[PDB]
C-alpha cells in the first residue's frame, strides 16, 4: 500500500503540503470530505488537475514521492484525502490523510445490500456521459471506517487487462460490456471483510490499472456480510 501521513492540521489562508511515498509511478489524490459520500478526484497523474477542480490544488512529484499542495486552504477543503498509485501489478491506495482546517459523466452502481456469508455478489456499474469504450474502468471498496482498497481493474477492450487486489484474487472476476456501457464485479465466497461501500471507477486511460489515473467515481453501492 501507500504511505501518507495519518493527519495535518492547518488554518484557512495556509499552504497545505501532504507527501506520499510507495508508488512505482505516477500519484493521485482523492478527496472525502465524509466517510459516506463519494470520493473526489482533485489531482490525477501527478500533476493533472480535473477541470472543475479550484485551482488552489495542484500536484507535483519528485523523485518518487508525490506532493498534494493546498494554496490558500479554506474550510470546505476539510476532508480525508487519499492518494493512489500502483505496484506490483496492481492499484494501490495510502491509508489517507485527514486534514483538518481550524476554522455529465456518471456511474451508478447496483447489486449491493445484505449477503449471505459464503456466497456471491454482482455488482453493476452503469456508465453515461463519455464514450466508455476508450476508458478503462475498475473498482474500489471501503469497509465502514477504513480507507479506499483497490479491487479490480479492466482494459477498455475488456479482454486484454484485467487484474485484482490480492484480497479478492480467486474469488472476484471483473467483466464489462462495451455495447451496454457496463462494468460487472463479481464476488464469491464472501466473508466479513468484504463488507464496504463498492465504487465504479474510470480511469483517463485506456488500459492502465493505476490508481493514480482515477477522474470519476460512482455513487456507491453498500455490500454488507452478515
Known amino acids: 500500500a501507500l504511505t501518507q501521513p495519518s493527519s495535518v492540521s492547518a488554518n484557512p489562508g495556509e499552504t497545505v503540503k501532504i507527501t506520499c511515498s510507495g508508488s512505482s509511478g505516477s500519484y493521485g489524490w482523492y478527496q ?5 459520500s463519494a470520493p473526489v478526484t482533485v489531482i490525477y497523474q501527478s500533476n493533472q488537475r480535473p477541470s472543475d477542480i479550484p485551482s488552489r490544488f495542484s500536484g507535483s512529484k519528485s523523485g518518487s514521492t508525490g506532493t ?51 456466497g456471491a455478489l454482482s455488482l453493476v456499474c452503469k456508465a453515461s456521459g463519455f464514450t466508455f469504450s476508450s476508458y478503462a474502468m475498475g ?23 484485467i487484474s485484482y487486489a490480492t ?18 464485479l463479481q464476488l464469491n465466497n464472501l466473508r466479513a471483510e468484504d463488507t464496504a461501500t463498492y465504487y465504479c471507477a474510470r480511469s483517463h486511460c485506456s488500459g492502465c490499472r493505476n490508481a493514480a489515473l482515477i477522474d470519476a467515481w460512482g455513487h456507491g453501492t453498500e455490500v454488507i456480510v452478515s
Open 139 to 161: 473498482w474500489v471498496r471501503q469497509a465502514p471506517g477504513k480507507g479506499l482498497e483497490w479491487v479490480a481493474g479492466i482494459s477498455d477492450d475488456g479482454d486484454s487487462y
Open 68 to 118: 498534494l499542495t493546498i494554496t490558500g486552504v479554506q474550510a470546505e477543503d476539510e476532508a480525508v484525502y487519499y492518494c493512489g498509485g500502483w505496484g506490483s501489478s496492481v492499484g494501490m491506495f495510502g491509508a489517507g490523510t485527514t486534514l483538518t482546517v481550524l476554522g455529465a459523466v456518471t456511474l451508478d452502481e447496483s447489486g449491493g445490500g445484505l449477503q449471505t456469508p459464503g
Open 32 to 36: 472525502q470530505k465524509s466517510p459516506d
Open 167 to 184: 484480497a479478492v484474487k480467486g474469488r472476484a472476476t471483473i467483466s464489462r460490456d462495451n455495447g451496454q456501457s457496463t462494468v460487472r
